[PDB]
From Swiss-Prot:
Cysteine protease that cleaves viral polyprotein and specific host proteins. It is responsible for the autocatalytic cleavage between the P1 and P2 regions, which is the first cleavage occurring in the polyprotein. Also cleaves the host translation initiation factor EIF4G1, in order to shut down the capped cellular mRNA translation. Inhibits the host nucleus-cytoplasm protein and RNA trafficking by cleaving host members of the nuclear pores. Counteracts stress granule formation probably by antagonizing its assembly or promoting its dissassembly. This is Protease 2A. It catalyses: Selective cleavage of Tyr-|-Gly bond in the picornavirus polyprotein. It comes from the Viruses. The active site is at residues 15, 33, 104. Zn(2+) 1 binds at residues 50, 52, 110, 112. Homodimer. The chain holds residues 869 to 1008 of 2193 of the full protein.
Amino acid sequence: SGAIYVGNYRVVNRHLATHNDWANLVWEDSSRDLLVSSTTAQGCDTIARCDCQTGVYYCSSRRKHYPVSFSKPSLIFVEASEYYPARYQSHLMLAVGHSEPGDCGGILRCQHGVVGIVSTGGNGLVGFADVRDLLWLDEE
Ligand SMILES: CN1CC[C@@H](Oc2cccc(F)c2)C1=O
Ligand SMILES: CN1CC[C@@H](Oc2cccc(F)c2)C1=O
Ligand SMILES: [Zn+2]
């Protein structure tokens, strides 16, 4: 689990989004596993505006933050699934690291702020859904 809170926005994994997330839908992308919902309480997170390829992510399944090198956001085919069709995901960044399904929503951050959230895992890779291209997350 886990979310980003910037301004009056909540960013979550689309597969983990609640009834309340969908009641207050701002934006979703099924190909990116991202959903943004509206919040009443102002969030204090800063979104990274950069092309860092290094940072730290939280891994709930190890209760540990790991420093990682990661790929630039790309279209990638993700093997295995759940209740979803083991398929393509856009704006996805891979690193070598530990990721289980419940690690989704773990934040990846550089010195500039929030880069993305854990979205995929397996084979000793962790996938992160990039949010840095969503410039509208920092205004009204
Ligand atoms: C996982 N999902 C998908 C829809 C969402 O709940 C809803 C359903 C209808 C109206 C609404 F405002 C929200 C939910 O729980
Ligand atoms: C659509 N979904 C839901 C979670 C993801 O599966 C995983 C599998 C392993 C690690 C991980 F972090 C995520 C997926 O394919
Ligand atoms: Zn950065």
